[PDB]
Ligand binder design. Sequence first.
Ligand SMILES: [Mg+2]
Length: 210
Amino acid sequence: VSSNGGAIKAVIYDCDGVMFDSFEANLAFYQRIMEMMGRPRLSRDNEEQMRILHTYANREVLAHFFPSPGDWEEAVRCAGAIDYRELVPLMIMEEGFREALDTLKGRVGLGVCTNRSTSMDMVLRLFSLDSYFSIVMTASRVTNPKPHPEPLLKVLEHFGIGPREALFVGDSEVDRLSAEAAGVPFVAYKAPLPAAYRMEHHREIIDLLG
Ligand SMILES: [Mg+2]
């Protein structure tokens, strides 16, 4: 509603690494693929396997664990058979995030800016966060997703504000580059990124609205 006397009229959040931790959801996704393929389960104690799950993308993860001829095609078939709606409850909300939204609601406009395509609206519904955000920017709602400025430029047009009247909270370089190209002050969340502000806990956002 923007009742804040400070310069910030809206706070925009990235999803993965900022609102939620999806490691347990991504791990359960590949564990189920191993079970359907009759392969041994992945181990949390295996550093290389966990490095692959943290850094590699979906296609390259399957291409890595299934190098035997014919197995990759069956692995992609198993991945597409899994209903991701069963994996959303495995996502772990970042500590103090809902409490921070409750502190912001009515004081500033609230938005989401994610590179997710279909899942974001379902994530907000299942975690009861769909009462907070007036704009939910996804990859399916822009021609050019992050690190392009388009999604953040649509957020400024949505609230009818200037770039320096908004904050974008992100944990990745693509979040920072999108904010830089849009001219929106960036807030680094638990990340080593050059930013206007940084946060180690979500409760700090109430002090960055000046
Ligand atoms: Mg992120």
